[PDB]
């Protein structure tokens, strides 16, 4: 139980997320990812998963797990998904067909919206080509929609590729801002470093019970020993292997 838990804040509990075109990523590795704090965070609008069950996530092992946090409009929450299309799915954040993870989204009209207009959030709408899986494009150069050379400012034939969100609390459902957090899971030849909470139980001795110690399973009783195990040694084995 002395193992350090991975900080699940700064991604869900963060004040203001990164822009949709400039989404940031936190590398979660060499820790114990306690997903129990997620199920009681907020009334999420969507909690879909792909490849990994939402329940078995607290016990499966993964080499590296990434978390991407961004805020999009309420009517475009169905766009962030493997195989889907739209503005966000093509020019802001594209998921591959082999995406393995979960998608989390919840309402944020009381956080990322102001009466004067929360124009700090930006989203990409114009680009020469669609985004690749897990690709980022932070370029803010004026997209030349027309064949005429564009000037240093916006014009009739060229507009800024990044448009601002006019988030206002007076809007109804669908137009309110929604914070979206995407979780990505992967495994490779590198050994796994995150397996989730192990959820140990109380110790029972002098009884015929099943014991489990860091993966070693068996059946037998436990009694206080008088041995002199070394500080680095963990398992005890006799002559009979």
């Amino acid at each position: 139980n002395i193992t350090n838990l991975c900080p699940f804040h700064e991604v869900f509990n963060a004040t203001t997320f990164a822009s949709v075109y400039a989404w940031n990523r936190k590398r979660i590795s060499n820790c114990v990812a306690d997903y129990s704090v997620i199920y009681n965070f907020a009334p999420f609008f969507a909690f879909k998963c792909y490849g990994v069950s939402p329940t078995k996530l607290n016990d499966l092992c993964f080499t590296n797990v990434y978390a991407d946090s961004f805020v999009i409009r309420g009517n475009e929450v169905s766009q962030i998904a493997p195989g889907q299309t739209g503005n966000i799915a093509d020019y802001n954040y594209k998921l591959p067909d082999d995406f393995t993870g979960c998608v989390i989204a919840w309402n944020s009209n009381k956080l990322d919206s102001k009466p004067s207009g929360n124009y700090n959030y930006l989203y990409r709408l114009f680009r020469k080509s669609k985004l690749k899986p897990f690709e980022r494009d932070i370029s803010t150069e004026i997209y030349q929609a027309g064949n005429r050379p564009c000037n240093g400012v916006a014009g009739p034939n060229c507009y800024s590729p990044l448009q601002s969100y006019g988030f206002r609390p007076t809007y109804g459902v669908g137009h309110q801002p929604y914070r979206v957090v995407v979780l990505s899971f992967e495994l490779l030849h590198a050994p796994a470093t995150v397996c989730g909470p192990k959820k140990s139980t109380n110790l029972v001795k002098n009884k015929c019970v099943n014991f489990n110690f860091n993966g070693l399973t068996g059946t037998g009783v436990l009694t206080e020993s008088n041995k002199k195990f070394l500080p680095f040694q963990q398992f005890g084995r006799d002559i009979a292997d």
Partner: antibody
Amino acid sequence: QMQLVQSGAEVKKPGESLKISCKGSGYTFSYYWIGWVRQMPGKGLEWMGIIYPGDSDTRYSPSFQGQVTISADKSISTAYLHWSSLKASDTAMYYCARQGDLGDWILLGYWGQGTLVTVSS
Amino acid sequence: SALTQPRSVSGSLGQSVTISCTGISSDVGGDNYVSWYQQHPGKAPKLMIYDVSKRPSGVPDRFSGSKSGNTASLTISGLQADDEADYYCCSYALSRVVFGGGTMLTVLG
């Protein structure tokens, strides 16, 4: 301009659970987060919690999750303070703060004038 | 995390003074969640610095700041008579706000 004036000073014995109010005007007191800040004489500012008058959503500091509760009424644009099990060391100056359109939802854009709560025997 | 500030600082009218404050955290999406507040003696605190690259309306432009890792500082372009008050740094990156140990600015005369 937008104004946010609190109630007058009060003095009660420890354990009476007094109540302090605050009246705002000049803006829609529904779309702005409002909170309170406690400061004992000699120390710095201590934030207790905030509340969004648009709904029942409330957030409080870990050191003030159950020591103080904050409520608001959108129909009269009035915020309220309530304590439980007061002690002699609870006498301190209290300040209010609102979100405003200057910064984010957590940023305290404006402040009040302060209310002195004296708790002694 | 907890913010720290020097309890006593000194200056002079027309000169400049700096107030350091550490303990700023960083979150995914931004790292400029640093704000400062000025509290007159016996009065309510007043917002003077929030989002350091920006300033509130009605606040004099003599106030400024800078960011260097987890350390923030408050700089004043010129001290005056009304500047003799307390200053408190604040951080709001983790959806929570905390205040330092308080300061006390004095000017010669």
